[PDB]
Amino acid sequence: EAVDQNTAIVGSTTGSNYYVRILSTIDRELLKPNASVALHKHSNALVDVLPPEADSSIMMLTSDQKPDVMYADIGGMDIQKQEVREAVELPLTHFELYKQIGIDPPRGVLMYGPPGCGKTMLAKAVAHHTTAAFIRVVGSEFVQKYLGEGPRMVRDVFRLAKE
Amino acid sequence: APPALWDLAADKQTLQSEQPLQVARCTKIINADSEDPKYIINVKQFAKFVVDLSDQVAPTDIEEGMRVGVDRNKYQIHIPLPPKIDPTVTMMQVEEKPDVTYSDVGGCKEQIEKLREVVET
Amino acid sequence: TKQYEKSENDLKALQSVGQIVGEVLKQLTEEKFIVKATNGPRYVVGCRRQLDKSKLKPGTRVALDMTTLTIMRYLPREVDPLVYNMSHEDPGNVSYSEIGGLSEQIRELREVIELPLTNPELFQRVGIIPPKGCLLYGPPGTGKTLLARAVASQLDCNFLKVVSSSIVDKYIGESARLIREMFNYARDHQPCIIFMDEIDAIGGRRFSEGTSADREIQRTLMELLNQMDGFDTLHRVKMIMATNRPDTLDPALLRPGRLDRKIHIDLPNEQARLDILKIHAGPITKHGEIDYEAIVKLSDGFNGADLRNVCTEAGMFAIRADHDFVVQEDFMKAVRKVADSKKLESKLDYKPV
Amino acid sequence: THELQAMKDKIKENSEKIKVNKTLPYLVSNVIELLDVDPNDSQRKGKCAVIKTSTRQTYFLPVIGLVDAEKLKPGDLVGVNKDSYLILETLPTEYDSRVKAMEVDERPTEQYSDI
């Protein structure tokens, strides 16, 4: 956080928060509440943040290989697809239709019930429907030997989602 | 404090004696021995250290699984430390001071007699 | 003569301090690269002029300088334990088909495991996929390990052996990346084969929720599935797991996919007892005129080593008789006695389906 | 033909320079043997093996120097001096403490005749 002028506190990659005098050039726009900023070796000086961002390790996508499953199986109903059509592509990118009716669409999707499998079929099937960046990580993927890197990884994962 | 005056005033000889043994960090366990001079030792820093021992300690006093001192510069063995153990668990285990003498018995003879000769006798 | 001074000049090269390895992430610009050491700190540092374009990479392990932290030369990897998994060997071919049973189970992993390497075209032309996993449980008899074990090195000199002792690791066990490391070097061998033995320990069930040790068991399972769920070699690699009873698999591993094939063992038959006999003869020999049917018939439903023990137990009675061979009358004595003693210990052969 | 004894003195004199480098084999480094050649970019050829350190850091050093690659398959326990990262000798045997030897028993005071 930015505590006052000419100086601010920055957590080190090792996890220890450092209180450092900021550089006199840019004190404001690239500061941001939470960001990854480069520091000097000995002095840990605040100079420049990321663009943002360089993102993080691991990877994304990989679901574009094709083919998986065609959505035409439920195409005969049209009672099921109408609720799906409103819950998939319109929540993806649409703007003026929301503020009008005033309903705020939720981001929540929770899948329970296996067996059977389901799931990833409709995942790569959405890849046929629409094209977007898919972040795929196991729940244990961010478990490491230190607890200082953990909060940064899940932050770097969710900060590219809003970006 | 008057008891704390001379108590705190003893740091002049302390800092003189603080320079030796200052490097004893940390307690380290050894592993095996291929030859007499050199032994492999492991420390709580997770880093294992092969080293020889100083001329002040005989090699025969180093046994497998013995925590010994160290000189962080030279890594050599300094002084052995007998306790390897244990974190906590002692304070409830250790019992001291007496109470409840033999005069509190309620008249049982043969019972308390044959269990007295198993330990006290 | 002068080769000693050459080694002395090599000691002058030994005076150079070793650099520190690291994992790159990405790049902000050509002058700013983001590297992360194995210890976990990240460093944005400059680079020197001697490197090449192959240094950049999409997050490949590199070494960092001890001062500028610049990358000199990238080392691919390092592994201490790998060599201990390189040395596993099993015979057959013949010694696999000599186990005497079950006859169709020898005909199973023959074409399932060994065949994909010699004739991969047979599966891809017809369009049928080979199984990516199998499960061998027991012990209704023997052969849970051997059935998959002999075909393991029969595919090629390629094999990688996994012991359940390496999964538990230590407090805050880092073997999560070692399960990735062990499978990473399992892909160094092609086509790869994966074993898992005695999963009734490391296969901890989440039915009744226990201490977090059951959770880290699932995390080690996540490291198993992830790399085998690729995005990488999948149909080419054959994974094998083994258990005492398959109630520990949970609905995930009980399902096919991860654990596909389930195979048990049955008992031999008459006149087939003479078949499995010939391969159990081996080193132990006996009198010229004999009939082995009395030997093996008295022991029914026994391990192949148990019958092998009966042959040695009858052979260790020979040294008490100070003769090389023994008549079959004293044989049946030592055969029947020891065999009936094993049957009282045969309890708990009932296994859940 | 007598020049062999002349060079034998300078190798023992330089082996004494190895002695001060052999005291002491200060730390344990897990060994991984590797053989790779790097084209430049004149030609630099040599055998270099990636080394570990039990401190959880990993380093990179040329093949030892002294004891050659004849021993062994990638090991551990070897001694190496401070930050110089040179391994003088490959030291056995395995590890660790009570794991190596569970219990040391010479012989019991009783014999099989006691039953």
Tab-separated table of all heavy atoms in Angstrom, chain A residues 13-14 38 41 48-51 54-57 62-63 115-117 124 136 138 140 143-146 149 153 156, chain C residues 24-28 32 34 36 38-44 69 172 174 176 180 215 219 222-223 226 231 251 255:
chain	number	residue	atom	x	y	z
A	13	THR	N	9.889	-10.681	-2.502
A	13	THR	CA	9.544	-12.002	-3.019
A	13	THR	C	9.704	-13.072	-1.946
A	13	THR	O	8.962	-14.061	-1.926
A	13	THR	CB	10.404	-12.330	-4.241
A	13	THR	OG1	10.325	-11.254	-5.184
A	13	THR	CG2	9.924	-13.610	-4.910
A	14	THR	N	10.665	-12.886	-1.039
A	14	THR	CA	10.824	-13.793	0.091
A	14	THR	C	9.689	-13.678	1.102
A	14	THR	O	9.606	-14.514	2.007
A	14	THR	CB	12.160	-13.533	0.791
A	14	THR	OG1	12.175	-12.202	1.320
A	14	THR	CG2	13.315	-13.697	-0.188
A	38	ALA	N	9.815	-4.000	-9.262
A	38	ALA	CA	11.212	-4.402	-9.202
A	38	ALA	C	11.941	-3.612	-8.120
A	38	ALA	O	11.692	-2.418	-7.938
A	38	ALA	CB	11.886	-4.192	-10.558
A	41	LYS	N	18.984	-5.051	-5.496
A	41	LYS	CA	19.517	-6.122	-4.662
A	41	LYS	C	19.699	-5.671	-3.217
A	41	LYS	O	18.961	-6.107	-2.328
A	41	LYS	CB	20.844	-6.628	-5.229
A	41	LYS	CG	21.487	-7.734	-4.408
A	41	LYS	CD	20.574	-8.947	-4.299
A	41	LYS	CE	21.283	-10.109	-3.622
A	41	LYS	NZ	21.703	-9.765	-2.234
A	48	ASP	N	10.442	0.769	-10.829
A	48	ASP	CA	9.447	0.544	-11.866
A	48	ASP	C	8.694	-0.745	-11.577
A	48	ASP	O	9.280	-1.742	-11.146
A	48	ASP	CB	10.094	0.478	-13.256
A	48	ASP	CG	9.071	0.400	-14.376
A	48	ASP	OD1	7.878	0.675	-14.124
A	48	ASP	OD2	9.462	0.062	-15.512
A	49	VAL	N	7.387	-0.713	-11.828
A	49	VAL	CA	6.535	-1.887	-11.678
A	49	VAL	C	6.515	-2.640	-13.000
A	49	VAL	O	7.274	-2.319	-13.922
A	49	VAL	CB	5.112	-1.494	-11.241
A	49	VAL	CG1	5.141	-0.790	-9.895
A	49	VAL	CG2	4.462	-0.612	-12.294
A	50	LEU	N	5.646	-3.642	-13.104
A	50	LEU	CA	5.470	-4.388	-14.343
A	50	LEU	C	4.554	-3.590	-15.269
A	50	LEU	O	4.058	-2.531	-14.860
A	50	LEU	CB	4.923	-5.782	-14.028
A	50	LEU	CG	5.875	-6.637	-13.186
A	50	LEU	CD1	5.300	-8.018	-12.923
A	50	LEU	CD2	7.245	-6.738	-13.845
A	51	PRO	N	4.307	-4.032	-16.523
A	51	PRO	CA	3.489	-3.207	-17.428
A	51	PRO	C	2.110	-2.760	-16.901
A	51	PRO	O	1.788	-1.585	-17.083
A	51	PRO	CB	3.337	-4.104	-18.660
A	51	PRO	CG	4.604	-4.862	-18.698
A	51	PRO	CD	4.981	-5.119	-17.259
A	54	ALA	N	3.974	-9.366	-16.752
A	54	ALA	CA	4.644	-10.559	-17.251
A	54	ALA	C	3.892	-11.838	-16.908
A	54	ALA	O	4.337	-12.925	-17.297
A	54	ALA	CB	6.066	-10.631	-16.701
A	55	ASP	N	2.790	-11.728	-16.173
A	55	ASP	CA	1.969	-12.857	-15.711
A	55	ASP	C	2.820	-13.712	-14.764
A	55	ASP	O	3.466	-13.178	-13.854
A	55	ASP	CB	1.381	-13.586	-16.911
A	55	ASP	CG	0.347	-12.743	-17.651
A	55	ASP	OD1	-0.181	-11.785	-17.043
A	55	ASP	OD2	0.063	-13.033	-18.833
A	56	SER	N	2.834	-15.027	-14.945
A	56	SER	CA	3.520	-15.926	-14.016
A	56	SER	C	3.934	-17.186	-14.775
A	56	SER	O	3.924	-17.221	-16.010
A	56	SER	CB	2.639	-16.231	-12.803
A	56	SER	OG	3.283	-17.148	-11.939
A	57	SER	N	4.320	-18.216	-14.027
A	57	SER	CA	4.779	-19.470	-14.605
A	57	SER	C	3.591	-20.334	-15.048
A	57	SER	O	2.453	-19.869	-15.174
A	57	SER	CB	5.662	-20.216	-13.603
A	57	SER	OG	4.955	-20.509	-12.410
A	62	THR	N	-4.218	-24.622	-24.445
A	62	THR	CA	-4.015	-26.048	-24.693
A	62	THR	C	-5.323	-26.790	-24.974
A	62	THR	O	-5.277	-27.981	-25.285
A	62	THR	CB	-3.271	-26.770	-23.551
A	62	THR	OG1	-4.053	-26.720	-22.351
A	62	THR	CG2	-1.920	-26.120	-23.300
A	63	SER	N	-6.483	-26.140	-24.877
A	63	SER	CA	-7.762	-26.790	-25.145
A	63	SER	C	-8.237	-26.607	-26.581
A	63	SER	O	-9.362	-27.007	-26.899
A	63	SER	CB	-8.828	-26.264	-24.183
A	63	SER	OG	-9.082	-24.890	-24.418
A	115	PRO	N	-19.815	-39.113	-9.771
A	115	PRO	CA	-20.040	-39.587	-11.146
A	115	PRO	C	-21.437	-39.267	-11.687
A	115	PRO	O	-22.377	-39.191	-10.896
A	115	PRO	CB	-19.846	-41.102	-11.021
A	115	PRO	CG	-20.206	-41.409	-9.620
A	115	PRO	CD	-19.740	-40.233	-8.814
A	116	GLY	N	-21.584	-39.111	-13.004
A	116	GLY	CA	-20.519	-39.354	-13.964
A	116	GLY	C	-19.600	-38.181	-14.248
A	116	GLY	O	-19.647	-37.166	-13.558
A	117	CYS	N	-18.761	-38.330	-15.278
A	117	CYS	CA	-17.715	-37.346	-15.536
A	117	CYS	C	-18.294	-35.979	-15.883
A	117	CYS	O	-18.088	-35.006	-15.148
A	117	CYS	CB	-16.802	-37.840	-16.660
A	117	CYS	SG	-15.921	-39.373	-16.289
A	124	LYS	N	-14.098	-28.104	-23.165
A	124	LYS	CA	-13.621	-28.039	-24.541
A	124	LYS	C	-14.754	-27.816	-25.537
A	124	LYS	O	-14.491	-27.400	-26.671
A	124	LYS	CB	-12.858	-29.319	-24.894
A	124	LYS	CG	-11.635	-29.569	-24.025
A	124	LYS	CD	-11.012	-30.929	-24.311
A	124	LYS	CE	-9.779	-31.161	-23.452
A	124	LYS	NZ	-9.196	-32.516	-23.656
A	136	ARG	N	-5.948	-23.357	-16.663
A	136	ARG	CA	-6.185	-24.700	-16.142
A	136	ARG	C	-5.088	-25.034	-15.138
A	136	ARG	O	-3.908	-25.123	-15.498
A	136	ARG	CB	-6.255	-25.726	-17.275
A	136	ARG	CG	-5.101	-25.699	-18.263
A	136	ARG	CD	-5.230	-26.845	-19.245
A	136	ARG	NE	-6.448	-26.723	-20.040
A	136	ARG	CZ	-7.325	-27.705	-20.221
A	136	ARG	NH1	-7.128	-28.888	-19.656
A	136	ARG	NH2	-8.403	-27.499	-20.963
A	138	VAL	N	-4.499	-27.440	-11.313
A	138	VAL	CA	-4.995	-28.352	-10.290
A	138	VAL	C	-5.059	-27.582	-8.977
A	138	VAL	O	-4.346	-26.590	-8.797
A	138	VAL	CB	-4.090	-29.590	-10.171
A	138	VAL	CG1	-4.731	-30.653	-9.289
A	138	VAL	CG2	-3.779	-30.155	-11.547
A	140	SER	N	-3.890	-28.349	-6.245
A	140	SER	CA	-2.617	-28.492	-5.554
A	140	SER	C	-1.450	-27.868	-6.313
A	140	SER	O	-0.306	-27.996	-5.867
A	140	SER	CB	-2.329	-29.972	-5.292
A	140	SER	OG	-1.090	-30.138	-4.624
A	143	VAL	N	0.806	-25.245	-4.436
A	143	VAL	CA	1.436	-25.634	-3.179
A	143	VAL	C	2.944	-25.667	-3.378
A	143	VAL	O	3.455	-26.365	-4.264
A	143	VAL	CB	0.905	-26.990	-2.695
A	143	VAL	CG1	1.629	-27.425	-1.430
A	143	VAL	CG2	-0.597	-26.919	-2.462
A	144	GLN	N	3.668	-24.909	-2.554
A	144	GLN	CA	5.118	-24.833	-2.666
A	144	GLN	C	5.779	-24.991	-1.303
A	144	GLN	O	5.097	-25.222	-0.299
A	144	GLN	CB	5.540	-23.507	-3.306
A	144	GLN	CG	5.076	-23.326	-4.744
A	144	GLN	CD	5.604	-24.407	-5.667
A	144	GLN	OE1	6.739	-24.864	-5.523
A	144	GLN	NE2	4.782	-24.822	-6.625
A	145	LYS	N	7.104	-24.869	-1.257
A	145	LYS	CA	7.851	-25.009	-0.015
A	145	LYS	C	7.814	-23.758	0.854
A	145	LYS	O	8.042	-23.858	2.063
A	145	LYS	CB	9.308	-25.378	-0.317
A	145	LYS	CG	10.052	-24.350	-1.157
A	145	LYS	CD	11.463	-24.823	-1.479
A	145	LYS	CE	12.196	-23.820	-2.356
A	145	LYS	NZ	13.568	-24.285	-2.702
A	146	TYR	N	7.531	-22.595	0.274
A	146	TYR	CA	7.438	-21.345	1.016
A	146	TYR	C	6.021	-20.808	0.913
A	146	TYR	O	5.331	-21.049	-0.084
A	146	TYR	CB	8.437	-20.308	0.493
A	146	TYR	CG	9.876	-20.609	0.842
A	146	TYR	CD1	10.908	-20.264	-0.020
A	146	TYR	CD2	10.205	-21.227	2.043
A	146	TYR	CE1	12.226	-20.534	0.299
A	146	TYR	CE2	11.519	-21.500	2.371
A	146	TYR	CZ	12.525	-21.152	1.495
A	146	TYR	OH	13.834	-21.422	1.819
A	149	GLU	N	5.352	-17.155	-1.751
A	149	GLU	CA	5.050	-17.163	-3.178
A	149	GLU	C	3.582	-17.465	-3.450
A	149	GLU	O	3.047	-17.042	-4.482
A	149	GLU	CB	5.948	-18.175	-3.895
A	149	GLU	CG	5.724	-18.283	-5.398
A	149	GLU	CD	6.009	-16.987	-6.136
A	149	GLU	OE1	6.789	-16.159	-5.621
A	149	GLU	OE2	5.444	-16.796	-7.235
A	153	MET	N	0.955	-16.033	-6.615
A	153	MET	CA	0.552	-16.811	-7.784
A	153	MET	C	-0.942	-16.677	-8.049
A	153	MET	O	-1.354	-16.346	-9.167
A	153	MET	CB	0.946	-18.276	-7.599
A	153	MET	CG	2.438	-18.533	-7.737
A	153	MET	SD	2.876	-20.267	-7.523
A	153	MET	CE	2.570	-20.477	-5.773
A	156	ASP	N	-1.596	-13.364	-9.366
A	156	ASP	CA	-1.220	-13.204	-10.766
A	156	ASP	C	-2.184	-13.948	-11.683
A	156	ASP	O	-2.326	-13.606	-12.862
A	156	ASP	CB	0.215	-13.686	-10.982
A	156	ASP	CG	1.231	-12.832	-10.248
A	156	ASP	OD1	0.890	-11.688	-9.873
A	156	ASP	OD2	2.370	-13.303	-10.044
C	24	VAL	N	13.304	-19.478	-15.554
C	24	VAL	CA	12.799	-18.252	-16.157
C	24	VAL	C	11.271	-18.282	-16.140
C	24	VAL	O	10.647	-19.350	-16.122
C	24	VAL	CB	13.341	-18.097	-17.590
C	24	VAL	CG1	12.948	-16.750	-18.193
C	24	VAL	CG2	14.847	-18.271	-17.612
C	25	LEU	N	10.664	-17.097	-16.128
C	25	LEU	CA	9.215	-17.007	-16.262
C	25	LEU	C	8.851	-16.448	-17.631
C	25	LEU	O	8.450	-17.197	-18.529
C	25	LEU	CB	8.624	-16.138	-15.151
C	25	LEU	CG	8.996	-16.513	-13.716
C	25	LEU	CD1	8.268	-15.618	-12.724
C	25	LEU	CD2	8.699	-17.979	-13.443
C	26	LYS	N	9.010	-15.136	-17.806
C	26	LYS	CA	8.775	-14.473	-19.081
C	26	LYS	C	9.717	-13.280	-19.182
C	26	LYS	O	10.637	-13.117	-18.375
C	26	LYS	CB	7.310	-14.043	-19.240
C	26	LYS	CG	6.346	-15.182	-19.537
C	26	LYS	CD	4.944	-14.679	-19.825
C	26	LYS	CE	4.004	-15.834	-20.125
C	26	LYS	NZ	3.789	-16.698	-18.932
C	27	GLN	N	9.486	-12.446	-20.190
C	27	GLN	CA	10.334	-11.294	-20.458
C	27	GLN	C	9.503	-10.025	-20.618
C	27	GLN	O	8.504	-9.995	-21.343
C	27	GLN	CB	11.184	-11.535	-21.709
C	27	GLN	CG	10.389	-11.784	-22.982
C	27	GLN	CD	11.268	-11.865	-24.214
C	27	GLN	OE1	12.479	-12.058	-24.116
C	27	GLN	NE2	10.660	-11.715	-25.385
C	28	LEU	N	9.918	-8.975	-19.907
C	28	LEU	CA	9.286	-7.669	-20.057
C	28	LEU	C	9.781	-6.967	-21.318
C	28	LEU	O	8.986	-6.427	-22.093
C	28	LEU	CB	9.553	-6.815	-18.814
C	28	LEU	CG	8.655	-5.607	-18.519
C	28	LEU	CD1	8.639	-5.327	-17.025
C	28	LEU	CD2	9.096	-4.368	-19.277
C	32	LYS	N	15.248	-6.767	-20.089
C	32	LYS	CA	14.736	-7.155	-18.777
C	32	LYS	C	14.096	-8.532	-18.887
C	32	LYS	O	13.071	-8.693	-19.559
C	32	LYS	CB	13.732	-6.128	-18.255
C	32	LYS	CG	14.322	-4.754	-17.981
C	32	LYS	CD	13.255	-3.783	-17.496
C	32	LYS	CE	13.843	-2.414	-17.196
C	32	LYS	NZ	12.803	-1.446	-16.754
C	34	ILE	N	12.756	-11.984	-16.531
C	34	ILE	CA	12.351	-12.377	-15.184
C	34	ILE	C	12.737	-13.832	-14.954
C	34	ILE	O	12.186	-14.743	-15.583
C	34	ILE	CB	10.850	-12.163	-14.971
C	34	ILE	CG1	10.480	-10.699	-15.211
C	34	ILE	CG2	10.443	-12.602	-13.572
C	34	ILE	CD1	9.054	-10.362	-14.863
C	36	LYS	N	13.561	-16.919	-11.906
C	36	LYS	CA	13.232	-17.338	-10.551
C	36	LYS	C	14.096	-18.533	-10.178
C	36	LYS	O	14.028	-19.580	-10.832
C	36	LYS	CB	11.747	-17.695	-10.421
C	36	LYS	CG	11.345	-18.180	-9.036
C	36	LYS	CD	9.843	-18.408	-8.929
C	36	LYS	CE	9.396	-19.586	-9.781
C	36	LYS	NZ	7.928	-19.820	-9.674
C	38	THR	N	15.528	-21.769	-7.979
C	38	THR	CA	14.847	-22.901	-7.357
C	38	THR	C	14.502	-22.620	-5.903
C	38	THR	O	13.575	-23.227	-5.354
C	38	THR	CB	15.710	-24.160	-7.457
C	38	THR	OG1	16.994	-23.910	-6.869
C	38	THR	CG2	15.885	-24.573	-8.907
C	39	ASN	N	15.232	-21.712	-5.260
C	39	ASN	CA	14.937	-21.306	-3.895
C	39	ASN	C	13.645	-20.506	-3.783
C	39	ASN	O	13.099	-20.395	-2.681
C	39	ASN	CB	16.102	-20.492	-3.327
C	39	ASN	CG	17.425	-21.232	-3.406
C	39	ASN	OD1	18.421	-20.696	-3.895
C	39	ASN	ND2	17.441	-22.469	-2.922
C	40	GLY	N	13.144	-19.948	-4.886
C	40	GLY	CA	11.910	-19.197	-4.870
C	40	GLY	C	11.949	-17.681	-5.053
C	40	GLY	O	10.923	-17.090	-5.406
C	41	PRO	N	13.084	-17.007	-4.833
C	41	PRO	CA	13.134	-15.576	-5.163
C	41	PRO	C	13.197	-15.352	-6.668
C	41	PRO	O	13.772	-16.154	-7.409
C	41	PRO	CB	14.408	-15.087	-4.464
C	41	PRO	CG	15.240	-16.292	-4.321
C	41	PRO	CD	14.262	-17.380	-4.022
C	42	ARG	N	12.590	-14.255	-7.114
C	42	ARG	CA	12.624	-13.852	-8.513
C	42	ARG	C	13.551	-12.653	-8.680
C	42	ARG	O	13.627	-11.788	-7.804
C	42	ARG	CB	11.221	-13.499	-9.012
C	42	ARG	CG	10.226	-14.645	-8.975
C	42	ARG	CD	8.842	-14.171	-9.393
C	42	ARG	NE	7.861	-15.252	-9.373
C	42	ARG	CZ	6.560	-15.083	-9.578
C	42	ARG	NH1	6.077	-13.871	-9.820
C	42	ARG	NH2	5.738	-16.123	-9.541
C	43	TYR	N	14.250	-12.605	-9.811
C	43	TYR	CA	15.203	-11.534	-10.077
C	43	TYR	C	15.035	-11.023	-11.497
C	43	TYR	O	15.057	-11.809	-12.449
C	43	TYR	CB	16.645	-12.011	-9.865
C	43	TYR	CG	16.937	-12.496	-8.463
C	43	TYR	CD1	16.877	-13.847	-8.145
C	43	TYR	CD2	17.279	-11.601	-7.459
C	43	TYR	CE1	17.146	-14.292	-6.864
C	43	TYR	CE2	17.549	-12.035	-6.175
C	43	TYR	CZ	17.480	-13.382	-5.883
C	43	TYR	OH	17.749	-13.821	-4.608
C	44	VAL	N	14.856	-9.712	-11.634
C	44	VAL	CA	14.958	-9.057	-12.935
C	44	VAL	C	16.377	-8.524	-13.079
C	44	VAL	O	16.777	-7.589	-12.378
C	44	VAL	CB	13.920	-7.934	-13.080
C	44	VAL	CG1	12.599	-8.496	-13.549
C	44	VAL	CG2	13.723	-7.222	-11.757
C	69	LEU	N	23.954	-11.991	-11.784
C	69	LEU	CA	22.855	-12.945	-11.913
C	69	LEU	C	22.469	-13.181	-13.370
C	69	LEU	O	21.345	-13.605	-13.657
C	69	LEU	CB	21.627	-12.507	-11.103
C	69	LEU	CG	21.848	-12.117	-9.640
C	69	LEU	CD1	20.567	-11.566	-9.032
C	69	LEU	CD2	22.346	-13.302	-8.832
C	172	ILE	N	6.107	-31.727	5.201
C	172	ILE	CA	5.985	-30.796	4.080
C	172	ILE	C	6.713	-31.416	2.894
C	172	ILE	O	7.644	-30.828	2.333
C	172	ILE	CB	6.517	-29.390	4.430
C	172	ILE	CG1	5.863	-28.879	5.712
C	172	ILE	CG2	6.200	-28.393	3.319
C	172	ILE	CD1	6.735	-28.967	6.935
C	174	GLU	N	8.240	-32.549	-0.379
C	174	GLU	CA	8.426	-31.928	-1.678
C	174	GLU	C	8.342	-32.922	-2.826
C	174	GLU	O	8.580	-32.533	-3.976
C	174	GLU	CB	9.778	-31.203	-1.739
C	174	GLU	CG	9.884	-29.999	-0.812
C	174	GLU	CD	10.174	-30.384	0.629
C	174	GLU	OE1	10.278	-31.597	0.916
C	174	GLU	OE2	10.294	-29.479	1.481
C	176	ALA	N	5.969	-33.891	-4.357
C	176	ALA	CA	5.002	-33.473	-5.367
C	176	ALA	C	5.695	-33.161	-6.688
C	176	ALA	O	5.205	-33.537	-7.759
C	176	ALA	CB	4.213	-32.259	-4.874
C	180	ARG	N	6.419	-35.603	-10.203
C	180	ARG	CA	6.603	-35.013	-11.523
C	180	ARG	C	7.990	-35.300	-12.074
C	180	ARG	O	8.131	-35.552	-13.273
C	180	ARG	CB	6.361	-33.503	-11.473
C	180	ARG	CG	4.962	-33.102	-11.030
C	180	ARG	CD	4.661	-31.655	-11.385
C	180	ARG	NE	5.525	-30.713	-10.677
C	180	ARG	CZ	5.182	-30.072	-9.566
C	180	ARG	NH1	3.987	-30.266	-9.026
C	180	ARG	NH2	6.033	-29.228	-8.998
C	215	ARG	N	-5.204	-35.638	2.860
C	215	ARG	CA	-5.262	-34.617	1.820
C	215	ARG	C	-4.008	-34.632	0.957
C	215	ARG	O	-4.095	-34.617	-0.278
C	215	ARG	CB	-5.457	-33.235	2.442
C	215	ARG	CG	-5.343	-32.100	1.435
C	215	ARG	CD	-5.322	-30.745	2.120
C	215	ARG	NE	-4.871	-29.688	1.219
C	215	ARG	CZ	-3.596	-29.412	0.974
C	215	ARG	NH1	-2.638	-30.114	1.569
C	215	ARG	NH2	-3.272	-28.433	0.141
C	219	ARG	N	-3.112	-34.970	-3.013
C	219	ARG	CA	-2.241	-34.077	-3.771
C	219	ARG	C	-1.188	-34.859	-4.547
C	219	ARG	O	-0.880	-34.522	-5.696
C	219	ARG	CB	-1.575	-33.067	-2.837
C	219	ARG	CG	-2.540	-32.105	-2.170
C	219	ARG	CD	-1.795	-30.967	-1.493
C	219	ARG	NE	-0.847	-31.440	-0.487
C	219	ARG	CZ	0.469	-31.479	-0.657
C	219	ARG	NH1	1.006	-31.068	-1.798
C	219	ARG	NH2	1.254	-31.927	0.314
C	222	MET	N	-2.864	-36.060	-7.423
C	222	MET	CA	-2.966	-35.012	-8.438
C	222	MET	C	-1.706	-34.932	-9.289
C	222	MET	O	-1.790	-34.678	-10.497
C	222	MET	CB	-3.234	-33.658	-7.779
C	222	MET	CG	-4.515	-33.587	-6.971
C	222	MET	SD	-5.993	-33.879	-7.955
C	222	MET	CE	-7.251	-33.750	-6.690
C	223	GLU	N	-0.535	-35.136	-8.683
C	223	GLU	CA	0.710	-35.132	-9.442
C	223	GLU	C	0.790	-36.342	-10.364
C	223	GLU	O	1.419	-36.291	-11.429
C	223	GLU	CB	1.904	-35.104	-8.486
C	223	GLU	CG	1.848	-33.972	-7.476
C	223	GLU	CD	1.791	-32.611	-8.131
C	223	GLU	OE1	2.502	-32.398	-9.134
C	223	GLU	OE2	1.027	-31.754	-7.642
C	226	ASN	N	-2.063	-35.447	-13.324
C	226	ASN	CA	-1.761	-34.270	-14.137
C	226	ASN	C	-0.904	-34.623	-15.348
C	226	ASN	O	-1.329	-34.460	-16.497
C	226	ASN	CB	-1.069	-33.212	-13.274
C	226	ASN	CG	-0.790	-31.930	-14.033
C	226	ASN	OD1	-1.483	-31.601	-14.997
C	226	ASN	ND2	0.225	-31.194	-13.596
C	231	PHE	N	-2.017	-33.841	-23.295
C	231	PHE	CA	-1.070	-32.704	-23.336
C	231	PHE	C	0.381	-33.200	-23.390
C	231	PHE	O	1.312	-32.411	-23.536
C	231	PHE	CB	-1.266	-31.719	-22.164
C	231	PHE	CG	-2.661	-31.161	-22.063
C	231	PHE	CD1	-3.146	-30.685	-20.855
C	231	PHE	CD2	-3.487	-31.118	-23.173
C	231	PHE	CE1	-4.425	-30.175	-20.760
C	231	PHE	CE2	-4.765	-30.613	-23.084
C	231	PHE	CZ	-5.235	-30.141	-21.878
C	251	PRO	N	-14.017	-43.400	-5.586
C	251	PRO	CA	-14.735	-43.413	-6.873
C	251	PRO	C	-13.925	-42.879	-8.043
C	251	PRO	O	-14.296	-43.121	-9.197
C	251	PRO	CB	-15.974	-42.548	-6.593
C	251	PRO	CG	-15.654	-41.785	-5.349
C	251	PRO	CD	-14.778	-42.689	-4.546
C	255	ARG	N	-13.068	-45.926	-10.960
C	255	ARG	CA	-13.505	-45.666	-12.320
C	255	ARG	C	-12.403	-46.063	-13.302
C	255	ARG	O	-11.218	-45.996	-12.965
C	255	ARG	CB	-13.840	-44.185	-12.485
C	255	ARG	CG	-14.743	-43.841	-13.654
C	255	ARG	CD	-15.057	-42.354	-13.656
C	255	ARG	NE	-16.177	-42.023	-14.530
C	255	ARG	CZ	-17.452	-42.135	-14.167
C	255	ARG	NH1	-17.758	-42.576	-12.957
C	255	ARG	NH2	-18.419	-41.809	-15.014
